[PDB]
Design a protein around this ligand. Structure first.
Ligand SMILES: Nc1c(Br)c(C(=O)O)c(Br)c(C(=O)O)c1Br
Ligand SMILES: Nc1c(Br)c(C(=O)O)c(Br)c(C(=O)O)c1Br
Ligand SMILES: Nc1c(Br)c(C(=O)O)c(Br)c(C(=O)O)c1Br
Ligand SMILES: Nc1c(Br)c(C(=O)O)c(Br)c(C(=O)O)c1Br
Length: 279
């Protein structure tokens, strides 16, 4: 399948080269898979989700996204126009308040929630969790992320936006999950992207168009935007049967575009998420 005039990051995910604008992908499109977006919520009524999004948990007075961040990330995972895996099922878990903040104890609870809740959902092709969030190092936060992964969920986490070594951030620094840095449309490391040995992969993160609340759209930037590209890619590749929740991060690194990014510090991987789809 081909999506013309796609957001640059979707075109980038399916290309050996920057500077194109068509997204190419297998029509299965993540059907039968599930992605949890653990964030500020998801505006499930947005037409872009087509009935495939639902809120399943909140720790606040509403499960609505009163921020936009979660809706944007969910859009990059799985919206019809802005998403990587256009037929996945999207489950929202609101661990962040409408200001974009949340306590680590709440975030941990939400991770353990997902590890159990997947047993209440139909996801025959597999389960992914996208965590566009983080703060400073916490062994308890990393452990929660590790449990979620161990439980059979492909966990993708943002590296963070401090232009620093992601070793000092959680859940970014958890070795067993997939830690995602950000790139721009010219294959440069995004200016804010964290780096370091704990990174597994880069995805598009600068000037990413996606859904927003009030049925709208906007372009914003962050490792928060790169993470759902990788999460959606995982869901897509799991639906294709190419990999599993336990092996998908490794598989994405194995099959990445290699050596094409600029301003990658020595010791950080130079790997850009790629679906290796041959039309
Ligand atoms: N990403 C990107 C874009 Br967008 C464009 C463009 O203007 O469409 C060009 Br001309 C290039 C290039 O340097 O060839 C690149 Br790389
Ligand atoms: N935790 C966190 C914060 Br706080 C911010 C921010 O300063 O707004 C951003 Br832009 C990101 C991102 O990289 O998307 C992340 Br992850
Ligand atoms: N035992 C086992 C299984 Br079952 C699977 C799997 O789900 O196919 C994987 Br991807 C691994 C691995 O991650 O290496 C292992 Br070890
Ligand atoms: N595989 C690989 C890569 Br990717 C890169 C790179 O990051 O561009 C380099 Br600098 C080397 C090298 O050491 O020659 C190799 Br081998």
């Amino acid at each position: 399948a081909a999506q013309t005039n796609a957001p640059w990051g979707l075109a980038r995910i399916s290309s050996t080269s920057p500077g194109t604008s068509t997204y190419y992908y297998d029509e299965s499109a993540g059907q039968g898979s599930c992605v949890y977006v653990i964030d500020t919520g998801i505006e499930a009524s947005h037409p872009e989700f087509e009935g495939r999004a639902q809120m399943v948990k909140t720790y606040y007075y509403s499960s609505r996204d009163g921020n936009g961040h979660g809706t944007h990330c969910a859009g990059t995972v799985g919206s019809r126009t802005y998403g990587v895996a256009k037929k996945t099922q999207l489950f929202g878990v609101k661990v962040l308040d409408d200001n974009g903040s949340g306590q680590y104890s709440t975030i941990i609870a939400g991770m353990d929630f997902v590890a159990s809740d997947k047993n209440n959902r139909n996801c025959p092709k597999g389960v992914v969790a996208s965590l566009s969030l983080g703060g400073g190092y916490s062994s308890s936060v990393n452990s929660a992320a590790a449990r979620l992964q161990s439980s059979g969920v492909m966990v993708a986490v943002a590296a963070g936006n401090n232009n620093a070594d992601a070793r000092n951030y959680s859940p970014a620094s958890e070795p067993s999950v997939c830690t995602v840095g950000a790139s721009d449309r010219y294959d440069r490391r995004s200016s804010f992207s964290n780096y370091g040995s704990v990174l597994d992969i880069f995805g598009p993160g600068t000037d990413i168009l996606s859904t927003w609340i009030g049925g709208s759209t906007r372009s914003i930037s962050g490792t928060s935007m790169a993470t759902p590209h990788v999460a959606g890619l995982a869901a897509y590749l799991m639906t294709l049967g190419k990999t599993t929740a336990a092996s998908a991060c490794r598989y994405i690194a194995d099959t990445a575009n290699k050596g094409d990014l600029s301003n990658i510090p020595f010791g950080t991987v130079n790997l850009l998420a790629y679906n290796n789809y041959q039309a």
